[PDB]
Amino acid sequence: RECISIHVGQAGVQIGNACWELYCLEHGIQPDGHVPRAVFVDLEPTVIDEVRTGTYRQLFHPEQLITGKEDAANNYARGHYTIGKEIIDLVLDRIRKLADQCTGLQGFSVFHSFGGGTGSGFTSLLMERLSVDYGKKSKLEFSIYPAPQVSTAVVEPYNSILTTHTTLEHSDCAFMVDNEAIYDICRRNLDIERPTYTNLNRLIGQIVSSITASLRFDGALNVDLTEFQTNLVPYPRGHFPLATYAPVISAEKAYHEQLSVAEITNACFEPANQMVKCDPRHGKYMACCLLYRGDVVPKDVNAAIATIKTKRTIQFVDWCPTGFKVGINYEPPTVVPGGDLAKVQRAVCMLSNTTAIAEAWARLDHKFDLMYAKRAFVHWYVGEGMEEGEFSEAREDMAALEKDYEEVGVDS
Amino acid sequence: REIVHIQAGQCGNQIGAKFWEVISDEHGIDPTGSYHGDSDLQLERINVYYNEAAGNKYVPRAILVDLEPGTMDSVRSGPFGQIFRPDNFVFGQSGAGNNWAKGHYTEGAELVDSVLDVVRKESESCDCLQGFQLTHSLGGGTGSGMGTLLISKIREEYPDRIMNTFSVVPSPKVSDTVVEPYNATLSVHQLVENTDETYCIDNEALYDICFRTLKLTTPTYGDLNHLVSATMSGVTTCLRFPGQLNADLRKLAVNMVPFPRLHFFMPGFAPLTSRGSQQYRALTVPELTQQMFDAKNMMAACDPRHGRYLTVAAVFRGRMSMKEVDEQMLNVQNKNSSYFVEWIPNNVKTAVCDIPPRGLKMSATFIGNSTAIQELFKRISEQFTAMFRRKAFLHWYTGEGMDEMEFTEAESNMNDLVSEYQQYQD
Amino acid sequence: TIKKKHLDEIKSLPKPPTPVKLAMEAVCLMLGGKKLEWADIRKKIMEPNFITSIINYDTKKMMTPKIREAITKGYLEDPGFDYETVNRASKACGPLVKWATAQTYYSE
Numbered sequence: 001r002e003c004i005s006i007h008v009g010q011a012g013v014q015i016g017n018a019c020w021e022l023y024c025l026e027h028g029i030q031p032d033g034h035v036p037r038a039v040f041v042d043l044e045p046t047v048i049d050e051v052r053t054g055t056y057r058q059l060f061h062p063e064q065l066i067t068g069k070e071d072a073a074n075n076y077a078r079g080h081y082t083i084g085k086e087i088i089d090l091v092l093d094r095i096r097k098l099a100d101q102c103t104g105l106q107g108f109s110v111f112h113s114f115g116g117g118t119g120s121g122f123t124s125l126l127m128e129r130l131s132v133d134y135g136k137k138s139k140l141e142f143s144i145y146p147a148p149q150v151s152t153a154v155v156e157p158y159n160s161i162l163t164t165h166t167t168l169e170h171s172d173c174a175f176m177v178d179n180e181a182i183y184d185i186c187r188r189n190l191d192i193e194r195p196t197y198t199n200l201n202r203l204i205g206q207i208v209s210s211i212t213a214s215l216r217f218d219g220a221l222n223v224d225l226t227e228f229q230t231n232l233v234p235y236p237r238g239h240f241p242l243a244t245y246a247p248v249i250s251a252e253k254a255y256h257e258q259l260s261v262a263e264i265t266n267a268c269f270e271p272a273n274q275m276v277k278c279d280p281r282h283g284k285y286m287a288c289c290l291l292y293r294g295d296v297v298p299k300d301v302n303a304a305i306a307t308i309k310t311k312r313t314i315q316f317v318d319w320c321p322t323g324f325k326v327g328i329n330y331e332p333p334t335v336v337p338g339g340d341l342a343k344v345q346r347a348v349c350m351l352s353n354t355t356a357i358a359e360a361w362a363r364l365d366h367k368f369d370l371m372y373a374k375r376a377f378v379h380w381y382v383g384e385g386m387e388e389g390e391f392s393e394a395r396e397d398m399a400a401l402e403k404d405y406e407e408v409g410v411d412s
Numbered sequence: 413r414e415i416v417h418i419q420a421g422q423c424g425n426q427i428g429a430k431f432w433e434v435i436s437d438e439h440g441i442d443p444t445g446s447y448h449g450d451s452d453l454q455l456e457r458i459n460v461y462y463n464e465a466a467g468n469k470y471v472p473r474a475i476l477v478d479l480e481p482g483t484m485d486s487v488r489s490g491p492f493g494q495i496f497r498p499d500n501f502v503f504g505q506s507g508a509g510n511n512w513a514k515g516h517y518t519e520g521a522e523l524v525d526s527v528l529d530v531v532r533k534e535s536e537s538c539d540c541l542q543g544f545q546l547t548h549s550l551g552g553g554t555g556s557g558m559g560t561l562l563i564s565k566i567r568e569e570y571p572d573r574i575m576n577t578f579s580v581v582p583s584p585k586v587s588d589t590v591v592e593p594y595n596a597t598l599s600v601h602q603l604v605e606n607t608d609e610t611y612c613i614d615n616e617a618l619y620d621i622c623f624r625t626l627k628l629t630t631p632t633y634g635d636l637n638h639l640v641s642a643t644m645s646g647v648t649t650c651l652r653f654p655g656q657l658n659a660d661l662r663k664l665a666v667n668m669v670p671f672p673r674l675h676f677f678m679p680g681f682a683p684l685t686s687r688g689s690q691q692y693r694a695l696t697v698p699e700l701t702q703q704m705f706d707a708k709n710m711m712a713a714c715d716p717r718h719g720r721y722l723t724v725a726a727v728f729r730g731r732m733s734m735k736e737v738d739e740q741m742l743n744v745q746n747k748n749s750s751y752f753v754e755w756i757p758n759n760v761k762t763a764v765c766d767i768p769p770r771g772l773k774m775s776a777t778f779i780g781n782s783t784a785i786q787e788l789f790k791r792i793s794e795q796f797t798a799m800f801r802r803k804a805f806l807h808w809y810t811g812e813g814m815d816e817m818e819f820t821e822a823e824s825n826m827n828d829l830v831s832e833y834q835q836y837q838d
Numbered sequence: 839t840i841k842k843k844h845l846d847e848i849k850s851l852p853k854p855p856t857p858v859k860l861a862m863e864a865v866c867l868m869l870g871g872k873k874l875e876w877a878d879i880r881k882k883i884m885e886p887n888f889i890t891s892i893i894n895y896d897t898k899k900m901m902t903p904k905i906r907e908a909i910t911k912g913y914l915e916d917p918g919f920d921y922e923t924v925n926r927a928s929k930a931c932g933p934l935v936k937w938a939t940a941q942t943y944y945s946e
């Protein structure tokens with residue numbers, strides 16, 4: 001029935017801020033209503049304390065939020081292993097503790113950013129543990145993955161590889177959304193030169209709102225979380241879809257906004273609005289879930305997909321004869337009242353595992369090696385210890401990923 | 413996380429007065445003082461610097477180390493002055509001694525344990541310990557010498573916790589001390605092993621920046637000290653403040669430092685406009701970027717042109733777009749591909765903090781790592797041998813009970829330390 | 839002598855890989871570090887005497903009765919103390935393993 005989310009990392013937290021914030025709007029549960037789904041975890045106290053001080057203060061229980069006075073470090077090593085371990089006990093107990101109460105949990109949709117020490121590192125084990133324990137459960141992870149050029153952290157590629165490597169067996173399905181990639185949506189589509197981190201999170205807010213919130217909300221098509229992986233993922237890794245939102249259209253400036261199903265759906269496919277750098281150069285599309293909310297007529301949808309299928313620039317992979325998963329939800333996307341959002345009557349979100357990510361991983365992968373050969377920052381990692389060890393061995397594993405991704409497509 | 417300040421040496425102390433001068437204001441503390449604090453927020457993080465004895469009284473947690481009674485006394489007798497807990501002062505009437513040798517071995521040694529006593533007491537105080545800060549000059553007997561020694565014990569006692577250093581590296585053009593090669597070389601020798609993060613400031617560089625960058629005709633020391641205090645504040649206190657993407661010291665350590673040397677960085681403040689006319693209000697973003705990155709307005713002597721960057725960290729504090737900040741940097745990166753250094757894919761570590769330096773709108777501290785500094789090091793050492801070979805000053809040191817080998821060793825270590833830097837450079 | 843790069847690598851590490859630390863304890867132990875504790879080792883680790891002092895070991899200085907046996911005990915014998923695994927630990931350590939079974943064995 002229900003799923004519980006966990007937000008980790010500062011970034012995962014700040015999304016954590018957004019995801020809930022959007023939620024409250026939708027549900028119409030004001031400041032002080034019911035009680036939250038999900039907990040937040042950060043090694044760095046200040047940020048979580050932002051939650052503590054900041055908006056939706058009461059809404060969470062202090063039980064829910066997990067913190068440490070202790071140092072985050074921008075590295076995989078402490079966060080995973082060293083500093084790492086101490087927190088998890090509280091963390092896991094929380095998740096089980098929460099899990100226990102609910103009836104029939106589908107699974108947890110964990111948020112993290114690749115992305116940092118607590119985002120990497122700490123989380124990786126957390127999911128790691130989950131697989132054994134929950135096991136039966138479906139474990140999706142929502143990740144934010146390093147902007148190609150942009151990445152803030154110096155260390156960063158070290159973190160991601162390890163994170164992706166470690167988690168990979170564990171997660172049923174992981175969504176990846178690109179930070180700078182989204183930015184282009186901001187820049188071109190809404191045209192904000194300004195946009196803050198809050199903005200992006202809002203954007204993710206909307207997209208996520210479909211996946212968890214709306215879907216679970218009863219609707220014509222009704223898609224399960226479990227379906228998500230089942231339909232989405234061809235193969236035992238771990239596979240990471242991208243998440244797309246058609247309606248991104250700017251609030252103030254332009255009002256085409258009645259853009260019926262055909263156009264809106266059409267909007268997503270173009271490389272522009274991915275919220276991922278991926279911009280499918282080559283990329284094949286294994287499979288897609290399209291989840292729509294708003295006023296949709298399934299004929300409108302059904303026709304719409306059919307044309308899309310044909311245009312054949314799209315070029316799906318052979319092995320899937322067809323892989324379109326329509327999901328229709330009654331209730332329209334809910335736009336946060338003021339700030340940026342268009343507030344379209346109908347919206348499309350569409351996720352898919354595409355061959356294209358293989359491009360991203362390669363680039364991501366490439367970053368890793370450059371530092372690694374010099375070996376760089378690693379002394380920090382080894383200190384947290386960590387060993388030569390994980391890095392290279394992990395390195396190969398994700399190297400497997402690149403082959404895996406490549407092999408999936410490009411051959412018939 | 414909590415941080416404890418160290419003031420060793422007169423320079424040492426002089427800066428310390430200024431550092432707290434700003435910091436106290438930054439936190440909103442009056443001399444004996446309390447949190448007048450314009451905003452609420454400043455109150456919360458304060459603990460890093462201070463302890464809560466009175467409730468009114470938040471007294472900065474840091475130690476003053478100085479053989480020279482005069483220097484310390486002036487500081488006490490000076491404005492902020494009274495604020496310090498008297499315990500904090502660790503003093504020794506004994507002759508200050510220009511000698512690094514005097515400070516380290518002979519004179520310094522006795523005091524040090526006494527010094528260490530308090531450091532622990534502050535250390536022990538409460539919550540978790542981020543690490544210690546240091547100011548001093550390579551400098552002189554108290555500035556280096558003892559101070560350089562002091563870190564040593566610190567390194568031993570709590571290895572995990574981090575030390576950042578500020579050293580006034582000897583000003584190239586005319587050295588304010590005759591001895592300058594001797595004290596400086598040995599002292600840096602200690603840091604390079606000891607302190608995981610070091611920051612260098614140079615006086616003339618300050619003059620240059622102050623004098624050009626600010627209209628300021630008459631730089632006073634209180635000025636240079638003041639500007640210097642500006643960077644470190646961005647570094648330490650700012651990140652303690654909230655930020656959309658906020659690093660902390662360890663982030664600064666981790667991201668910034670490729671290799672174990674701990675390396676040295678050069679602070680650079682984002683806003684540096686004259687009083688006055690210069691107030692453009694072109695803070696927006698890019699103007700900030702231009703300012704820090706530019707060759708001048710680099711606190712340390714060396715010029716990045718020379719000049720490649722192992723790492724850059726900008727801790728902007730102010731409310732700015734993530735989009736612009738992150739995006740802008742890239743163009744900087746692409747624009748200056750030659751110097752940046754290829755291997756490390758994203759040179760700049762970006763920190764954003766919500767709240768600006770209490771007066772001003774938007775500023776970033778710029779910190780971090782470049783090959784160029786190596787040029788600086790050659791200077792000290794180069795002086796070192798010319799002095800050394802002739803051994804002009806030396807007798808003071810050795811009479812003090814110092815070793816011949818010791819001199820040689822220190823130079824070579826830093827000397828090759830220079831050599832290390834080049835390797836990355838190419 | 840031996841490049842510093844190796845040395846700091848171990849030291850800076852806030853918590854070294856355990857057997858490495860154990861090894862360091864062992865080596866320090868061969869040095870006869872009285873203290874169990876890290877810190878005493880730590881400052882010891884960087885010290886001017888330290889760098890050379892290890893490299894040349896005066897035989898006379900080392901004392902047979904206690905010192906010989908513990909090392910001889912099959913600390914080496916230990917289930918994974920010894921050369922092969924430790925060697926994995928580092929390039930640096932590797933030359934040392936040879937040292938352990940070396941002049942010490944021959945003379946005695």
Ligand SMILES: CC(=O)O[C@H]1C(=O)[C@@]2(C)[C@H]([C@H](OC(=O)c3ccccc3)[C@]3(O)C[C@H](OC(=O)[C@H](O)[C@@H](NC(=O)c4ccccc4)c4ccccc4)C(C)=C1C3(C)C)[C@]1(OC(C)=O)CO[C@@H]1C[C@@H]2O
Nearest residue numbers: 433434437638639642645683684685686687769770771772
């Ligand atoms: C009316 C008005 O807006 O006045 C400004 C001002 O005119 C300018 C010129 C200030 C001024 O700074 C200097 O003139 C200066 C003097 C010696 C050394 C260095 C700088 C200012 O004095 C400095 C002061 O800075 C602050 O308030 C920050 O919080 C700063 N504080 C201190 O340095 C400080 C000074 C005295 C006592 C306690 C603290 C700070 C910066 C980083 C981290 C922590 C604190 C500001 C904005 C101004 C005046 C007052 C004129 C500038 O400097 C700073 C550090 O902001 C110089 O270029 C900038 C641009 C500012 O607009």
Ligand SMILES: Nc1nc2c(ncn2[C@@H]2O[C@H](COP(=O)(O)OP(=O)(O)OP(=O)(O)O)[C@@H](O)[C@H]2O)c(=O)[nH]1
Nearest residue numbers: 009010011014072073074113115116117118119197
């Ligand atoms: N979309 C989005 N991306 C964010 C946000 N905050 C941070 N990021 C991105 O996530 C990465 C930053 O991770 P950090 O904040 O450094 O670290 P962390 O993952 O929270 O964990 P630590 O390293 O231990 O602090 C960068 O690539 C940022 O661009 C946010 O609110 N929204």
Ligand SMILES: Nc1nc2c(ncn2[C@@H]2O[C@H](COP(=O)(O)OP(=O)(O)O)[C@@H](O)[C@H]2O)c(=O)[nH]1
Nearest residue numbers: 421422423426549551552553554555588615633
């Ligand atoms: N920026 C700066 N440099 C200083 C100050 N005082 C002394 N110096 C510098 O410190 C060096 C002299 O060392 P000094 O501080 O007298 O040594 P000590 O007092 O014996 O430890 C010279 O290079 C000076 O320019 C100061 O208040 N600010």
Ligand SMILES: [Mg+2]
Nearest residue numbers: 009010044072
């Ligand atoms: Mg964080």
